[PDB]
Amino acid sequence: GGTIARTIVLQESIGKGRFGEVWRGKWRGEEVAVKIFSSREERSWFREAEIYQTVMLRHENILGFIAADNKDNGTWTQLWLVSDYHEHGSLFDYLNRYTVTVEGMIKLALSTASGLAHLHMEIVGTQGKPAIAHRDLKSKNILVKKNGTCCIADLGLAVRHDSATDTIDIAPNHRVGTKRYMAPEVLDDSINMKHFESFKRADIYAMGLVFWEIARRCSIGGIHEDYQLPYYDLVPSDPSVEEMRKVVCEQKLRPNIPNRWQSCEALRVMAKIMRECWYANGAARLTALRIKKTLSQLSQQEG
Ligand SMILES: Cc1cccc(-c2nc(C(C)(C)C)[nH]c2-c2ccc3c(c2)OCO3)n1
Secondary structure: OOOOOOOEEEEEEEEEOOOOEEEEEEEOOEEEEEEEEOHHHHHHHHHHHHHHOOOOOOOOOEOOEEEEEEEEOOOOEEEEEEEEOOOOOEHHHHHHHOOEOHHHHHHHHHHHHHHHHHHHOOEOOOOOEOEEEOOOOOOOOEEEOOOOOEEEOOOOOOEEEEOOOOEEOOOOOOOOOOHHHOOHHHHOOOOOOOOHHHHHHHHHHHHHHHHHHHHOOEOEOOEOOOOOOOOOOOOOOOOOHHHHHHHHHHHOOOOOOOOHHHOOHHHHHHHHHHHHHOOOOHHHOOOHHHHHHHHHHHHOOOO
């Protein structure tokens, strides 16, 4: 029969995605993550399997895809996605559970930038990678590995660009992602969605919000902040598009950069990246590659 899903034994319920339910599984002795969709969730399943099967997608800071499969238990067909297990889980869960070192922060920050710069960069060739925008970049969708670098999951909302024709592989809706991480252009309806660079610019904003969440947990000599989500101070816990538009577009607040980040050098680089990631004009924002370059300077420096 089939060689993946037949041979996997589910052990623990991890939790829900947007669609489909996440499990700890044993494959051939090794631990795996399994994500399971109903027969009516087939568009979501297929599209996510389509993105992970993009040629040249595999980076150390993208989640390692094993396989899409079917599994008939006897009553009903389950649609499976199988991946690498990471015991720490999400960047959200890690930053709630733990503080980090100075070296710890940059490992989390660099890897997330490297992941998105890989995802964004077109690789021309016969085995050629399309440029890929995420559309839902957040701490819940980034996983943390056992080495303490990150990898990006939740590519099911992603869009892919052919540079020759200048087309996106789907006709994209307004307002698909997590409402809290939606960029100002996405919030106020103003984003042009036959411009591909705009979707990349929308991802850099949200990585800025992820970079804030990490930098709060940086324990220099006692002193760290608590875990918070971006706009904990300014919106409710499941916030509306209306509620988010009033803070980000109308009032023009980033997340608040505290005083003691000015003392340490590594936090000021991160603080400068954050405030260069927030910008209501998307064209003002940095590339993931310029962020990757800058953090890779800081990594190969301070003694
Ligand atoms: C393509 C694929 C296959 C299997 C799992 C996941 C997946 N989807 C998500 C969310 C963010 C909820 C959409 N998380 C995972 C995930 C992946 C690996 C894990 C894990 C969860 O817990 C520890 O190890 N995606």
